[PDB]
């Protein structure tokens, strides 16, 4: 050990450190500055960034044997503080840079020390300084951050005012459709949010600390567990198998489809006969420490018998693979699509057909922050449950059977969390952690490390697809036919309802009056299947948005023309044989014609005999709700100090719930003239929320945000005076009158999608958009890189803009990753960010537009859809398509590695 | 486990947390704020108060369970910071109300509580408050901080600006003599000092935390060590007993007088064939949490053979009693007096002589940090303790024979700390934390709690004292004799030397030219002795003044005019025959004397049939150095920034260390230019720093200020130009020439005192000092109130009024204590603040005067010299005889407990 007299946050501090130790946890662990956030700990995601003399270093690289006696270390306290914001936070929370807020310390840290070096950056020099310094973000696209660090720059060059990053009211008063801050901005800026991690280290000295034993085989039947090494070791309270657990032992799908061969209730919540999946938890190791209990965990030899296993959906799905639920087909659904007439004889009459195969495969959500739960006993004799959950009222009923406990014995509380991209719509650590909790008696607390957030989480689920379309010459659709198999994986939850997708979005925003086609849902050993942002529309829309590029080829037509030519106007159907709600596609690419004609105008100008340049269009669209008849619960709370509580279980991803909530609440209460600082959200908790429903299927602002509507809509009744004007609270009271009212709203004209035909009305509300991407193909190595990417998007009517545009810069960077770089295939070399391909800053380009083309939505709150998976829908179409356009060469199988395109180049 | 969400210093904090958890602990350790201060744990100090929702209330008495959702928490941390500190925190500072400064933040964050429910009280309404509220200090005598909280009001209240809490630097620049802040103030009013306990939660996980296995009875053969149950308990690593000491397992008294009957190795540092007193350490457990560590150590098994204890010296001293030592006598030292002529014969010719018998008892220290300490093992292989020690030097050569390393294997480092007054010039837990290190490997630590601080720390040793005068009928004295016995408790370091100061003391400040006496030393099975503030002189001062007010009496004559008589004059010598260094007693008293006569007036004005107001006089005297030629070291460092670090190991138990080096230093550099907050001073460190010596004996000023003042000539020098002017750090290390330099000083006139006749020159510098007590006794119930106290004092210089006003008022609060409530005779009752009569606030008076009546010492630096131990010379002295003025009855056995005064009043 030895003391080292340092300087942190300007405040003498005299150390006692091992030489060995990690600075990201003396700084955490030994002084409590949670500020720092660590998601990676391998230096690869910025998040833990600190100067330490004058350099911005990663903390969890960084031993203390390299700070010095007398060193100068800042964190995120020490930049500023709630009631002392440095311009560098003031300017992130005006521009919205804090989505998630995970990544939002180290950024600003990182930022400072840019500015300290260079005061006058242009905006190529903040990203050169945030990709050498790896600072990632995978919620808002960047331009942002960059965005905040310019403005902040300004301020402190003198340049403008510091009162200028501070919010300007509107004139109006009206906070809807303005870039009024997110109430919790200046928590995360300030590193004073506390995630699933930092609530760990707070927890009281009895909390026990769990380390997951975990199969390293993909496929097994197991024979025994032996922990007898394992408590004997260091700080080792017990070890939990699934003998501890006192329900079945699985958890249920809930909603699994009458016509699945499966009961929905295949998986485990502790391993006990079988091995399905590469990392599947065995047993618990409970301990002091995560780090004693991790040792402990290597120490717990599991007995078993290797099978072969499926690691792709056409090997599972071989007519003679064997069955990995003994008693069920591996292929265990199917869904039709039959719309309109028998499409063999149009397409043998047609003038033109096109087929193709394509492939979109297993890509990784890796949000910054690495799964993180925990669980105890309470005082009322429930069990609670606190994680990334952003569906707290499903998971509850997915494992209380599992857990064994009673429905209203158990609640689950949604922590702050730094991002899902929808692998929380997925239970991961609940049970696990209510099952330690049930038989210890103690708090337990189960953090994963970066490497099984990525083995041991769902995945987007591969699908292989076939897709034809007939037409006439002149570019009019007659005929679809669609073929698609998913691999979901060993875990059925949601499998066949994201098979359905299919059917509802291959070749959707074109009139299509006949369509074929059937997809199948495979159980595999490969990760299981849980929501990706898109939901398969990303796999869908890839499929169908490049054949429509090759039915232009082929026609010689514009593609964009073509598009044209086919969009949903007035008369249509969707392929479930729905009236779109609004038709913006014709306005949209109207509007974007000219932009794009420039565009390929330049791409032209600038390419050389090395840089091939290219342009690509595609068309995007998808359901804001779960289908059929989705609703939703608020209740508007008039408190004793005039302020106003608006109750929901608007589960946060990081995507603006918090600002959702005010902002929706605020347009509803404006005749009684409510302030917006005034306005206070609820998070999510099974027990005292509403069962507002899971953030999934970008359904909240509409489903959530028509319920707070209604909710301050009955309010504003409740509190009416007779005669004109509204009574205070203490008036309500003295009169005995109730003061927090229910509302509720439901998307009553939705049915859902029929089993056998595919056909029904499953949303009432989609979004809309149109994607144009610029690319430039180094044709010697096969690398593209994207310069530019527009969305033209059709939201009805913004909440708020900041929200909406982070949300759109946000998507369209997840598109560049799956259409480049992104994917989990190789067990070990896809478990790091670098080596799966996350989009570092240079990778996503400084030019992300939008074009709002809103047409207002009849059943959308004040006429808003969401927004959330608009900008994943196509936006990997569109820049394949940009390659083609680039190159000649078509890649069908994403994603588009360079050596892939170099193959293709050269063949 | 219950969540609980809250705000604490103005963050909202998502706190999970045990209902039956105390706030101090949840505040601490959950959440790091370690500004929450935490001494006794029982409700009694008030160092833990934090603000709960507009309420002061103790954290260490405040379950979670009375935390309700949504309250509100203020402590320090949320008063200020140190670059933004609240007017209370400024006035701290200008005030010197942080001495130790382990109070401060638990007054400050009171304060504000009062401030905020009355913003412009009188100073008798900040007493009641602290009060009320049970803030205690043991440093500044309450009077600094009353000060503190009505200048803060008046800024607060806009009657005066908040630029007049910050110093004012005086026009000639000089801070010697001024009231210039000490370095360490901001840290203290901040709760950014980390003092051991704070230091222990900011340790790395490795750490092992220790519990004392104690002995519960006070005497006995200790036949065996059972530790098989407290093996088996939650979180233990190990127990640690005299079998794993790999030295001698003996601490060293290390300067044994020669005629001393015991070798000084008597003390075990692990009790190994018997128990010498209560308390004492017989194992240690180590384990992951001082919680599991205790909870263990109680189930350790000692199997022992209790033996008859001796309780009091006059019990151990009889002929026939039991050698607690097997080999050595129980009286193991006498220390004769002997100067001039055979005392009989002038007894039996004087005109007057008086005799009297009289106790002073084993006063507690009573800090309000209990003990605290750590240990690891260095990267250097060495051996390194971070404790209270206030000798570092002192005690490295005292614990390392025991421990089993060389000298150069160990380092001792004084930690920041809360206050010793003296229990800190003995080892306590150095041994106990070394022995553990050494055998686990690993870092411990140790945290006493107060009942541990108060039965097993050293205390105040009882003197049964018998003191005679003959006089003349005009008061002139003639000759003394004199008898003490020193109850020392088992372990015999710096007895025999304690003993010597009665031969010293006794009678000191006057002209005595023959004197008679023996001093012995007695081991007993009572808390062993280690240094208390004024070390021999509290008890010999208390005979000889309580005996001059009796010899005044008995001649009819006033008792200050009595020593006015005889009071040292030129030509005069002391009890050891030295002739005094300067002579300001009579100048004292004729400035005293007509505040004497109008107090005398005033009790006798405001008598009452049941109050009767009585005025008591003493002097005192001690001196300022260790025996002998003492010596210091400084180096004086110029560094690379221009700044100037004067490197010692003066030691700061609070009195003021930084500030007594940075104004010493400040003075001798004024040829350079020097500006005082350039100006930098070292923590006590047995490898990095000189062996200045330890904070004992009112030296430090004198010792090591010499030697700062000769290092700080000889850096001028190192530093002058040829032609005039200094060289900068660059000139110098651009000629290779030094820039860190030397000084060292010895009080080279003074010589040991006699084994056989006590006469010598001791000391090269006194401090002398008259006290004037002012008490109201309620002869209806014995209670003695002390309305005012007023302190004389001749200092020679002061370096800095802040620490020597401070020094004052803490010392005379201290003599209150030992005069009326103060003891440690029952183990049991007297292990508690309240249960030893610790001065709260209504027992202090607010009019504590001090008139400085400086000499200018020939020895001195800038004729300075100490103030430490001047207040508690005697003002008990003058107490007692207030009580007698008052009311007839002289209290010759202190303390003065209300039973014992009304039993003497009805006698
Ligand atoms: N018009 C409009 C719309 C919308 N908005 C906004 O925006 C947001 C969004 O919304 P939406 O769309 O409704 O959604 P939500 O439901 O809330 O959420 C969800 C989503 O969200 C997204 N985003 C995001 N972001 C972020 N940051 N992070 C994340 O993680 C995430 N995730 C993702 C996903 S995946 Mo799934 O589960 O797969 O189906 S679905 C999803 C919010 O804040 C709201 O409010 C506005 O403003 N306006
Ligand atoms: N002239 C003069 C003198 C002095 N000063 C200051 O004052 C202080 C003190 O000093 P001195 O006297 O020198 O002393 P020191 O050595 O440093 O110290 C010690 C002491 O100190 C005291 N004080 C105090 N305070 C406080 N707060 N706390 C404490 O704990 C204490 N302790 C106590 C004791 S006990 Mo023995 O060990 O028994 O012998 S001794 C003693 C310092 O700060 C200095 O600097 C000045 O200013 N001036
Ligand atoms: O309410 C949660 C849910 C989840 C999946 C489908 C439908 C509803
Ligand atoms: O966005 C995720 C999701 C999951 C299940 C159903 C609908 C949406
Ligand atoms: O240097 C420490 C010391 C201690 C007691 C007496 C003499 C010196
Ligand atoms: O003030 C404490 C002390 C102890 C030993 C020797 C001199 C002084
Ligand atoms: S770079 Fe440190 S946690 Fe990712
Ligand atoms: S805001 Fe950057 S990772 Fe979420
Ligand atoms: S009153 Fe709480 S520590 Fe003393
Ligand atoms: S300053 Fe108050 S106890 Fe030391
Ligand atoms: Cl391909
Ligand atoms: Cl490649
Ligand atoms: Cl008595
Ligand atoms: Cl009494
Ligand atoms: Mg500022
Ligand atoms: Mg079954
Ligand atoms: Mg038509
Ligand atoms: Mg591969
Ligand atoms: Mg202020
Ligand atoms: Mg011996
Ligand atoms: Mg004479
Ligand atoms: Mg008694």
Same mark, same amino acid.
């Given at each position: 050990?030895?003391?080292?007299?340092?300087?942190?946050?300007?405040?003498?501090?005299?150390? &006692?450190?091992?030489?060995?130790?990690?600075?990201?946890?003396?700084?955490?662990?030994?002084?409590?500055?949670?500020?720092?956030?660590?998601?990676?700990?391998?230096?690869?995601?910025?998040?833990?960034?600190?100067?330490?003399?004058?350099?911005?270093?990663?903390?969890?690289?960084?031993?203390?044997?390299?700070?010095?006696?007398?060193?100068?270390?800042?964190?995120?306290?020490?930049?500023?503080?709630?009631?002392? /914001?440095?311009?560098?936070?003031?300017?992130?929370?005006?521009?919205?840079?804090?989505?998630?807020?995970?990544?939002?310390?180290?950024?600003?840290?990182?930022?400072?020390? /840019?500015?300290?070096?260079?005061?006058?950056?242009?905006?190529?020099?903040?990203?050169?300084?945030?990709?050498?310094?790896?600072?990632?973000?995978?919620?808002?696209?960047?331009?942002?951050?960059?965005?905040?660090?310019?403005?902040?720059?300004?301020?402190?060059?003198?340049?403008?005012?510091?009162?200028?990053?501070?919010?300007?009211?509107?004139?109006?008063?009206?906070?809807?459709?303005?870039?009024?801050?997110?109430?919790?901005?200046?928590?995360?800026?300030?590193?004073?949010?506390?995630?699933?991690?930092?609530?760990?280290?707070?927890?009281?000295?009895?909390?026990?600390?769990?380390?997951?034993?975990?199969?390293?085989?993909?496929?097994?039947?197991?024979?025994?567990?032996?922990?007898?090494?394992?408590?004997?070791?260091?700080?080792?309270?017990?070890?939990?198998?699934?003998?501890?657990?006192?329900?079945?032992?699985?958890?249920?799908?809930?909603?699994?489809?009458?016509?699945?061969?499966?009961?929905?209730?295949?998986?485990?919540?502790?391993?006990?006969?079988?091995?399905?999946?590469?990392?599947?938890?065995?047993?618990?190791?409970?301990?002091?420490?995560?780090?004693?209990?991790?040792?402990?965990? +290597?120490?717990?030899?599991?007995?078993?018998? +290797?099978?072969?296993? $499926?690691?792709?959906?056409?090997?599972?799905?071989?007519?003679?693979?064997?069955?990995?639920?003994?008693?069920?087909?591996?292929?265990?659904?199917?869904?039709?699509?039959?719309?309109?007439?028998?499409?063999?004889?149009?397409?043998?009459?047609?003038?033109?057909?096109?087929?193709?195969? &394509? $492939?979109?495969?297993?890509?990784?959500?890796?949000?910054?922050?690495?799964?993180?739960?925990?669980?105890?006993?309470? @005082?009322?004799?429930?069990? $609670?449950?606190?994680?990334?959950?952003?569906?707290?009222?499903?998971?509850?009923?997915?494992?209380?059977?599992?857990?064994?406990?009673?429905?209203?014995?158990?609640?689950?509380?949604?922590?702050?969390?730094?991002?899902?991209?929808?692998?929380?719509?997925?239970?991961?650590?609940?049970?696990?952690?209510?099952?330690?909790?049930?038989?210890?008696?103690?708090?337990?607390?189960?953090?994963?490390?970066?490497?099984? #957030?990525?083995?041991?989480?769902? !995945?987007?689920?591969?699908?292989?697809?076939?897709?034809?379309?007939?037409?006439?010459?002149?570019?009019?659709?007659?005929?679809?036919?669609?073929?698609?198999?998913?691999?979901?994986?060993?875990?059925?939850?949601?499998?066949?309802?994201?098979?359905?997708?299919?059917?509802?979005?291959?070749?959707?925003?074109?009139?299509?009056?006949?369509?074929?086609?059937?997809?199948?849902?495979?159980?595999?050993?490969?990760?299981?299947?849980?929501? &990706?942002?898109?939901?398969?529309?990303?796999?869908?829309?890839?499929?169908? +948005?490049?054949?429509? @590029?090759?039915?232009?080829?082929?026609?010689?037509?514009?593609?964009?023309?073509?598009?044209?030519?086919?969009?949903?106007?007035?008369?249509?159907?969707?392929?479930? *044989?729905?009236?779109?709600?609004?038709?913006?596609?014709?306005?949209?690419?109207?509007?974007?014609?000219?932009?794009?004609?420039?565009?390929?105008?330049?791409?032209?100008?600038?390419?050389?005999?090395?840089?091939?340049?290219?342009? *690509?269009?595609?068309?995007?669209? $998808?359901?804001?709700?779960?289908?059929?008849?989705?609703?939703?619960?608020?209740?508007?709370?008039?408190?004793?100090?005039?302020?106003?509580?608006?109750?929901?279980?608007?589960?946060?991803?990081?995507?603006?719930?918090?600002?959702?909530?005010?902002?929706?609440?605020?347009?509803?209460?404006?005749?009684?003239?409510?302030?917006?600082?005034?306005?206070?959200?609820?998070?999510?908790?099974?027990?005292?929320?509403?069962?507002?429903?899971?953030?999934?299927?970008?359904?909240?602002?509409?489903?959530?945000?028509?319920?707070?509507?209604?909710?301050?809509?009955?309010?504003?009744?409740?509190?009416?005076?007779?005669?004109?004007?509204?009574?205070?609270?203490?008036? /309500?009271?003295?009169?005995?009158?109730?003061?927090?009212?229910?509302?509720?709203?439901?998307?009553?004209?939705?049915?859902?999608?029929?089993?056998?035909?595919?056909?029904?009305?499953?949303?009432?509300?989609?979004?809309?958009?149109?994607?144009?991407?610029?690319?430039?193909? @180094?044709?010697?190595?096969?690398?593209?890189?994207?310069?530019?990417?527009?969305?033209?998007? @059709?939201?009805?009517?913004?909440?708020?803009?900041?929200?909406?545009?982070?949300?759109?810069?946000?998507?369209?960077?997840?598109?560049?990753?799956?259409?480049?770089?992104?994917?989990?295939?190789?067990?070990?070399?896809?478990?790091?960010?670098?080596?799966?391909?996350?989009?570092?800053?240079? #990778?996503?380009?400084? !030019?992300?537009?939008?074009?709002?083309?809103?047409?207002?939505?009849?059943?959308?709150?004040?006429?808003?859809?969401?927004?959330?998976?608009?900008?994943?829908?196509?936006?990997?179409?569109?820049?394949?398509?940009?390659?083609?356009?680039?190159?000649?060469?078509?890649?069908?199988?994403?994603?588009?590695?360079?050596?892939?395109?170099?193959?293709?180049?050269?063949?």
């Amino acid at each position: 050990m030895i003391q080292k007299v340092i300087t942190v946050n300007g405040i003498e501090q005299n150390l &006692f450190v091992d030489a060995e130790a990690l600075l990201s946890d003396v700084l955490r662990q030994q002084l409590g500055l949670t500020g720092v956030k660590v998601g990676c700990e391998q230096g690869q995601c910025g998040a833990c960034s600190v100067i330490l003399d004058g350099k911005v270093v990663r903390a969890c690289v960084t031993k203390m044997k390299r700070v010095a006696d007398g060193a100068q270390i800042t964190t995120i306290e020490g930049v500023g503080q709630p009631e002392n /914001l440095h311009p560098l936070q003031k300017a992130w929370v005006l521009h919205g840079g804090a989505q998630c807020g995970f990544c939002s310390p180290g950024f600003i840290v990182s930022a400072k020390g /840019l500015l300290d070096t260079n005061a006058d950056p242009s905006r190529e020099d903040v990203r050169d300084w945030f990709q050498k310094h790896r600072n990632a973000c995978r919620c808002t696209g960047y331009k942002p951050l960059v965005d905040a660090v310019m403005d902040a720059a300004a301020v402190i060059n003198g340049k403008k005012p510091e009162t200028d990053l501070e919010f300007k009211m509107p004139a109006d008063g009206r906070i809807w459709g303005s870039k009024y801050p997110r109430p919790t901005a200046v928590a995360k800026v300030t590193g004073t949010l506390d995630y699933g991690a930092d609530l760990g280290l707070k927890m009281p000295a009895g909390t026990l600390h769990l380390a997951m034993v975990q199969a390293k085989v993909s496929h097994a039947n197991i024979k025994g567990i032996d922990t007898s090494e394992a408590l004997t070791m260091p700080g080792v309270h017990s070890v939990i198998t699934h003998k501890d657990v006192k329900g079945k032992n699985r958890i249920t799908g809930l909603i699994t489809f009458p016509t699945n061969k499966g009961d929905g209730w295949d998986r485990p919540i502790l391993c006990d006969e079988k091995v399905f999946q590469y990392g599947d938890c065995i047993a618990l190791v409970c301990a002091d420490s995560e780090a004693n209990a991790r040792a402990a965990a +290597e120490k717990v030899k599991v007995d078993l018998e +290797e099978l072969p296993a $499926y690691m792709s959906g056409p090997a599972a799905a071989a007519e003679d693979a064997i069955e990995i639920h003994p008693g069920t087909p591996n292929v265990y659904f199917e869904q039709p699509i039959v719309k309109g007439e028998d499409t063999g004889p149009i397409f043998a009459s047609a003038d033109v057909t096109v087929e193709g195969d &394509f $492939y979109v495969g297993r890509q990784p959500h890796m949000p910054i922050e690495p799964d993180v739960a925990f669980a105890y006993m309470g @005082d009322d004799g429930k069990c $609670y449950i606190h994680s990334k959950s952003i569906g707290v009222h499903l998971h509850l009923y997915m494992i209380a059977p599992g857990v064994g406990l009673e429905p209203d014995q158990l609640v689950l509380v949604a922590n702050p969390m730094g991002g899902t991209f929808g692998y929380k719509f997925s239970p991961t650590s609940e049970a696990l952690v209510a099952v330690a909790a049930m038989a210890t008696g103690r708090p337990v607390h189960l953090r994963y490390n970066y490497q099984q #957030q990525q083995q041991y989480t769902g !995945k987007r689920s591969p699908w292989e697809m076939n897709v034809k379309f007939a037409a006439k010459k002149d570019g009019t659709l007659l005929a679809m036919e669609s073929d698609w198999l998913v691999d979901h994986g060993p875990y059925s939850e949601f499998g066949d309802l994201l098979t359905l997708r299919g059917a509802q979005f291959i070749g959707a925003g074109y009139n299509i009056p006949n369509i074929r086609g059937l997809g199948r849902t495979v159980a595999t050993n490969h990760v299981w299947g849980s929501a &990706f942002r898109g939901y398969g529309a990303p796999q869908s829309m890839f499929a169908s +948005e490049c054949l429509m @590029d090759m039915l232009a080829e082929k026609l010689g037509m514009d593609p964009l023309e073509l598009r044209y030519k086919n969009a949903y106007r007035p008369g249509d159907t969707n392929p479930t *044989g729905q009236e779109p709600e609004v038709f913006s596609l014709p306005d949209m690419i109207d509007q974007l014609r000219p932009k794009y004609q420039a565009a390929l105008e330049k791409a032209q100008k600038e390419s050389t005999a090395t840089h091939k340049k290219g342009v *690509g269009i595609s068309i995007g669209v $998808y359901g804001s709700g779960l289908d059929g008849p989705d609703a939703s619960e608020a209740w508007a709370e008039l408190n004793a100090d005039g302020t106003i509580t608006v109750h929901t279980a608007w589960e946060d991803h990081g995507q603006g719930a918090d600002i959702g909530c005010v902002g929706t609440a605020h347009e509803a209460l404006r005749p009684m003239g409510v302030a917006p600082e005034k306005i206070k959200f609820t998070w999510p908790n099974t027990a005292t929320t509403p069962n507002s429903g899971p953030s999934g299927g970008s359904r909240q602002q509409v489903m959530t945000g028509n319920a707070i509507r209604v909710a301050c809509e009955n309010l504003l009744k409740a509190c009416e005076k007779p005669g004109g004007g509204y009574y205070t609270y203490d008036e /309500l009271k003295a009169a005995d009158k109730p003061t927090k009212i229910t509302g509720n709203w439901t998307a009553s004209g939705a049915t859902h999608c029929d089993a056998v035909t595919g056909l029904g009305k499953p949303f009432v509300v989609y979004m809309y958009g149109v994607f144009m991407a610029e690319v430039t193909v @180094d044709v010697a190595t096969g690398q593209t890189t994207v310069d530019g990417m527009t969305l033209m998007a @059709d939201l009805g009517s913004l909440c708020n803009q900041l929200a909406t545009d982070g949300q759109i810069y946000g998507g369209l960077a997840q598109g560049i990753g799956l259409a480049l770089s992104e994917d989990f295939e190789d067990i070990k070399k896809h478990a790091t960010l670098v080596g799966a391909g996350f989009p570092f800053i240079k #990778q996503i380009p400084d !030019k992300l537009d939008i074009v709002y083309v809103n047409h207002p939505r009849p059943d959308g709150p004040f006429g808003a859809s969401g927004v959330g998976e608009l900008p994943l829908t196509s936006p990997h179409a569109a820049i394949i398509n940009a390659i083609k356009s680039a190159t000649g060469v078509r890649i069908y199988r994403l994603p588009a590695y360079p050596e892939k395109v170099l193959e293709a180049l050269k063949a």
